[PDB]
Enzyme design. Structure first.
Site, PDB file in Angstrom:
ATOM      1  N   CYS A 111      57.378  57.024  43.406  1.00 27.67           N
ATOM      2  CA  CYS A 111      56.153  57.817  43.432  1.00 27.67           C
ATOM      3  C   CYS A 111      54.887  56.969  43.391  1.00 27.67           C
ATOM      4  CB  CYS A 111      56.143  58.801  42.262  1.00 27.67           C
ATOM      5  SG  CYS A 111      57.560  59.914  42.244  1.00 27.67           S
ATOM      6  N   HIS A 244      49.661  61.349  41.267  1.00 24.87           N
ATOM      7  CA  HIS A 244      50.949  61.792  41.755  1.00 24.87           C
ATOM      8  C   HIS A 244      51.204  63.237  41.324  1.00 24.87           C
ATOM      9  CE1 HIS A 244      55.119  62.060  42.691  1.00 24.87           C
ATOM     10  NE2 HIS A 244      55.494  62.074  41.424  1.00 24.87           N
ATOM     11  N   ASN A 274      56.729  68.209  44.188  1.00 20.55           N
ATOM     12  CA  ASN A 274      56.767  66.756  44.118  1.00 20.55           C
ATOM     13  C   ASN A 274      57.394  66.095  45.353  1.00 20.55           C
ATOM     14  OD1 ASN A 274      57.173  64.099  43.602  1.00 20.55           O
ATOM     15  ND2 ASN A 274      58.096  64.390  41.586  1.00 20.55           N
TER      16      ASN A 274
HETATM   17  C1  LIG Z   1      58.005  68.222  28.425  1.00 20.63           C
HETATM   18  C2  LIG Z   1      58.127  68.479  29.933  1.00 20.63           C
HETATM   19  N1  LIG Z   1      59.369  69.256  30.310  1.00 20.63           N
HETATM   20  C3  LIG Z   1      59.044  70.645  30.977  1.00 20.63           C
HETATM   21  C4  LIG Z   1      57.573  71.072  31.183  1.00 20.63           C
HETATM   22  S1  LIG Z   1      60.553  68.383  31.300  1.00 20.63           S
HETATM   23  O1  LIG Z   1      60.839  67.100  30.686  1.00 20.63           O
HETATM   24  O2  LIG Z   1      61.679  69.258  31.558  1.00 20.63           O
HETATM   25  C5  LIG Z   1      59.833  67.972  32.959  1.00 20.63           C
HETATM   26  C6  LIG Z   1      59.230  66.651  33.099  1.00 20.63           C
HETATM   27  C7  LIG Z   1      58.633  66.204  34.360  1.00 20.63           C
HETATM   28  C8  LIG Z   1      58.038  64.824  34.413  1.00 20.63           C
HETATM   29  O3  LIG Z   1      57.538  64.354  33.392  1.00 20.63           O
HETATM   30  N2  LIG Z   1      58.138  64.203  35.681  1.00 20.63           N
HETATM   31  C9  LIG Z   1      57.687  62.879  36.091  1.00 20.63           C
HETATM   32  C10 LIG Z   1      57.032  61.942  35.172  1.00 20.63           C
HETATM   33  C11 LIG Z   1      56.604  60.643  35.598  1.00 20.63           C
HETATM   34  C12 LIG Z   1      56.811  60.226  36.954  1.00 20.63           C
HETATM   35  C13 LIG Z   1      57.445  61.101  37.892  1.00 20.63           C
HETATM   36  C14 LIG Z   1      57.902  62.440  37.503  1.00 20.63           C
HETATM   37  C15 LIG Z   1      58.569  63.287  38.596  1.00 20.63           C
HETATM   38  O4  LIG Z   1      58.955  64.473  38.300  1.00 20.63           O
HETATM   39  O5  LIG Z   1      58.692  62.748  39.746  1.00 20.63           O
HETATM   40  C16 LIG Z   1      58.635  67.084  35.505  1.00 20.63           C
HETATM   41  C17 LIG Z   1      59.218  68.386  35.410  1.00 20.63           C
HETATM   42  C18 LIG Z   1      59.823  68.865  34.168  1.00 20.63           C
HETATM   43 BR1  LIG Z   1      60.536  70.647  34.328  1.00 20.63          BR
END
Ligand SMILES: CCN(CC)S(=O)(=O)c1cc(C(=O)Nc2ccccc2C(=O)O)ccc1Br
Ligand SMILES: CCN(CC)S(=O)(=O)c1cc(C(=O)Nc2ccccc2C(=O)O)ccc1Br
Lengths: 319, 320
Positions: A111, A244, A274
């Site tokens: 990303c 991103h 994404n």
């Molecule tokens: C506390 C957040 N939670 C739900 C709101 S999660 O960890 O399930 C979750 C967490 C993320 C996330 O932090 N994604 C990323 C972080 C850094 C770099 C790339 C990504 C990506 O999704 O590509 C995305 C979707 C979900 Br659903």
């Protein structure tokens, strides 16, 4: 005349539109997806692979800017879902558009790929040996997803966008910080290819399909990306931020941590979800076509990416 | 003080060693058949290491040999077309394993031109004034990408990696470069396809990940286009040695003749390693430095030239 600027923007995504509705009927997950992520729909390929997308972007950039393919000195693609490992997507694009004079390669930085590649593009120009290049982030994540895992299948879309970058009289790329930490690479994998040669005796069971540790990357974004941004700007010195487009909640958090006006963080994941390396350039082009950003406006804009690697980086440029 | 220079070199290949004698029993053919075609006697093949590991060793060794601390590295570039994952890059994995916590990292995809493409890229990076110390490693585990029933291609490749430490210098070392590509022929040389079997995909694609190689198309390609590439940088007068991708010695013979450059200047490597792709040049580079053939900080006119999938080719003219 050593400085570089973005001279044109372009995006292209597949017409097939898939709604949270559709994905839920198909999966059994309702729009807790949207409040969870800020996503309503992504575009998914039905016949296109990644080079097909990047080609369109390359073709559009030549059209809109009115340059000949033979002006392009180089073509970088930031993808992590290429048709082949070899050829690179960029070589495929370079062929498809007849940019005979360009060298081309792909950059693997998840990303962060578009920020890494725009940064490397800037160096290729500062050297004085190259004047015009195409930088494109493109991705077809739908062929990597295990569509029966609702955890991630709902997160990613396919798409592509990019920019033409040419030499300039005055500086635009003002500052940058590129970072990485492979001590946490476990947290977001895709595209493992299994060695089944007669000589191989490991039985590693890494996935070919994407896998992330949801809590880790999220936490990583808020703490680390926030510091990286603040490494370049405070609220007084930035006008817009294109991050991103991975989760709107990350955008919210990063805004409060960083004390940068939430308005200034443009958003997109409602339409595209994404799309990894493509995400920033898609947003950028929409913002320009919206009229929000104007090439030459001198608006102060920071692009910051983060993802697998782990990788992250920001660019501060005056548009 | 913003000129890149190669300050250290190193290489690493798996321990497992497969001789023609072995493949020939394996593939049901003769020792001489294999040898005549390839010009190769043995080559290394991984048994438990992936590209990331082979590169790990390289970085590790460059750190120990140069006595540099990982924390000093600013960037890590890996030229590879056979990564562990598409994400994370091999570059990052290495960056974790050596605790280069201060360095950013990514892979470059440009097949057998990768190292050269990547070396070129590190020069721009350093040239900018933003970075002074970097690792540039070419490493490949191509054995996982071959149909080992096919004596036609599988007898060609070996595994391994090797790279260089680059540091900023007062006096310019990288003199001239010409990087080229021709994607109008990408069909010629392909590996690693990955089929979209998403519920939304209505395309129809066959997709061995296994390499497809159009032999004479790329043989004639190399002889023609590479030669012209090499000559745009030097002539026999202005070069001491040339390190070329080790695809097949007969390409090195024919290219020497076209360029009209002494054949003894073209260093050759392939008997014991075979064709190591992005690895080929940097491994040749480290051996030659072992021999003392090349001496760091001597000012030897040297050109590294690569050519491969893409199609890609390119040459660096640097002073050693
Ligand atoms: C506390 C957040 N939670 C739900 C709101 S999660 O960890 O399930 C979750 C967490 C993320 C996330 O932090 N994604 C990323 C972080 C850094 C770099 C790339 C990504 C990506 O999704 O590509 C995305 C979707 C979900 Br659903
Ligand atoms: C007419 C040439 N034939 C035998 C001499 S071959 O096609 O089997 C062959 C042909 C090549 C070749 O042309 N290789 C390449 C060309 C361009 C770029 C890379 C390579 C490479 O092998 O890495 C190498 C070995 C063999 Br054996």
């Amino acid at each position: 005349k050593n400085y570089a600027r973005i001279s044109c923007t372009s995006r292209y995504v597949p017409e097939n539109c898939v709604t949270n509705h559709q994905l839920s009927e198909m999966m059994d997950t309702d729009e807790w997806i949207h409040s969870r992520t800020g996503i309503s729909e992504r575009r998914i390929v039905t016949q296109e692979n990644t080079s097909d997308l990047c080609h369109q972007v390359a073709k559009q950039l030549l059209e809109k800017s009115g340059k000949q393919a033979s002006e392009i000195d180089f073509i970088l693609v930031a993808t992590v879902t290429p048709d082949f490992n070899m050829p690179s997507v960029a070589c495929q694009v370079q062929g498809a558009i007849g940019a005979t004079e360009a060298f081309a390669f792909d950059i693997s930085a998840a990303c962060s790929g578009f920020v890494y590649a725009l940064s490397m593009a800037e160096k290729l120009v500062l050297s004085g040996r190259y004047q015009t290049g195409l930088v494109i982030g493109g991705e077809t994540f739908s062929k990597m997803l295990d569509w029966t895992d609702r955890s991630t299948a709902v997160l990613f879309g396919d798409g592509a966008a990019g920019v033409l970058i040419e030499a300039a009289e005055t500086p635009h790329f003002l500052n940058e910080k590129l970072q990485a930490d492979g001590q946490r690479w476990a947290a977001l994998t895709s595209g493992y290819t299994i060695n089944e040669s007669p000589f191989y005796q490991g039985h590693k069971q890494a996935s070919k399909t994407l896998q992330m540790e949801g809590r880790s990357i999220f936490d990583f974004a808020i703490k680390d990306v926030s510091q990286n941004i603040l490494s370049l700007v405070t609220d007084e010195t930035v006008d817009y931020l294109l991050l991103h487009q991975a989760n709107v909640r990350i955008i919210d958090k990063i805004a409060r941590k960083t004390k940068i006006s939430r308005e200034k963080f443009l958003t997109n994941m409602d339409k595209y979800g994404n799309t990894s390396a493509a995400s920033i350039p898609i947003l950028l082009d929409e913002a320009v076509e919206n009229g929000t950003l104007i090439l030459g406006s001198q608006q102060r804009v920071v692009l910051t990416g983060f993802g697998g690697g782990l990788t992250w980086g920001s660019l501060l440029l005056t548009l």
